[PDB]
Amino acid sequence: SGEAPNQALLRILKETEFKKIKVLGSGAFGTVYKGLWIPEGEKVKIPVAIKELATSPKANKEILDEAYVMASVDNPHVCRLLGICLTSTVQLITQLMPFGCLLDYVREHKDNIGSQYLLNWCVQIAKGMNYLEDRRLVHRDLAARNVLVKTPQHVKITDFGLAKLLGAEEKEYHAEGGKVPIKWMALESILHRIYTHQSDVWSYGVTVWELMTFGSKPYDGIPASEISSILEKGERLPQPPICTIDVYMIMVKCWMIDADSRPKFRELIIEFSKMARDPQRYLVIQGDERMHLPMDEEDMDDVVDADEYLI
Numbered sequence: 001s002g003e004a005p006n007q008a009l010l011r012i013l014k015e016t017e018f019k020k021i022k023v024l025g026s027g028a029f030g031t032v033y034k035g036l037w038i039p040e041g042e043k044v045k046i047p048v049a050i051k052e053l054a055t056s057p058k059a060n061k062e063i064l065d066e067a068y069v070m071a072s073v074d075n076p077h078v079c080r081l082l083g084i085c086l087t088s089t090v091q092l093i094t095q096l097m098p099f100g101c102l103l104d105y106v107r108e109h110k111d112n113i114g115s116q117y118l119l120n121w122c123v124q125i126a127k128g129m130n131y132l133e134d135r136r137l138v139h140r141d142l143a144a145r146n147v148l149v150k151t152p153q154h155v156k157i158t159d160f161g162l163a164k165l166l167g168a169e170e171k172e173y174h175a176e177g178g179k180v181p182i183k184w185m186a187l188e189s190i191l192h193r194i195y196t197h198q199s200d201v202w203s204y205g206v207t208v209w210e211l212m213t214f215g216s217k218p219y220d221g222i223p224a225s226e227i228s229s230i231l232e233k234g235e236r237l238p239q240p241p242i243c244t245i246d247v248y249m250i251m252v253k254c255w256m257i258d259a260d261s262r263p264k265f266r267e268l269i270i271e272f273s274k275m276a277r278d279p280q281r282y283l284v285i286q287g288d289e290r291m292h293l294p295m296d297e298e299d300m301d302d303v304v305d306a307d308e309y310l311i
């Protein structure tokens with residue numbers, strides 16, 4: 001057959017099964033809460049995040065599309081849907097990520113993030129994105145705000161509100177309209193509404209730059225209108241102060257014009273894993289050693305553990 005059957009299970013949760021405890025956020029999406037989910041008949045309590053909206057027919061369709069994608073993913077670096085609650089306003093239930101988004105975590109802990117953390121997050125994001133490539137899914141919205149922090153040692157990719165799955169032979173995705181985040185998009189996406197896994201790599205590059213700059217806004221002050229122009233000339237984001245040319249060289253490769261010349265997510269896992277084995281050699285951070293967030297063979301330079309070598 002053309003493609004494999006998606007036998008994932010969509011779990012439906014009774015409103016009684018979970019207790020809403022506090023409001024976490026409220027924005028463009030709607031309203032996210034912190035809660036606890038006690039599966040009936042079990043002696044278990046699960047810290048969860050709940051998303052509800054305001055009832056529009058197109059709004060529910062978008063929520064259910066995100067639910068379809070989140071329910072089909074199973075990876076340590078991807079957020080998974082626990083279930084949906086079908087009350088008058090539909091509720092999505094995910095695992096609580098206590099530390100919130102990575103963009104607000106780097107901004108808040110700017111003077112306590114060591115090179116070992118930055119490089120470990122780059123590896124973890126590349127692992128989640130590579131798993132999404134294996135599952136023929138193109139995210140289309142990879143950014144530091146769409147990466148959650150379970151613990152400072154473990155992050156996961158979220159926000160499947162724009163993600164499109166690809167058919168076994170379909171290699172590109174031809175979008176038509178909608179509010180798209182311009183400062184993270186590949187040049188093909190801006191000019192021709194084309195999205196591949198290689199356009200995700202471009203957004204991975206911008207995400208890494210956001211982390212290396214501790215939350216700086218890309219192309220700050222410059223409007224979306226002339227951002228396409230700047231990229232066409234040959235201008236890219238500047239080299240973050242803490243970055244050695246090795247780290248910045250990888251970012252610049254993510255931003256090539258030829259999508260096929262950009263690195264693959266499996267290559268990004270290898271490169272950043274090598275760097276995480278000697279972090280102070282690739283990121284120069286003011287007081288790198290005194291920071292805390294809550295060899296038998298000859299040349300150990302290109303040594304990579306098999307768990308990071310994926311084909």
Ligand SMILES: *CCC(=O)N1CC[C@H](n2cc(-c3ncnc4cc(OC)c(OC)cc34)c(-c3cccc(OC)c3)n2)C1
Nearest residue numbers: 024025032049050051092094095096097098100101104145
């Ligand atoms: C900085 C990022 C941000 O504000 N976002 C809001 C919309 C996006 N998002 C985040 C979550 C979410 N998921 C899990 N745990 C969270 C914990 C938080 O604080 C402790 C938190 O604070 C805002 C957000 C968390 C969700 C989300 C929640 C439930 C379901 C669902 O999708 C089906 C997504 N969305 C990033």
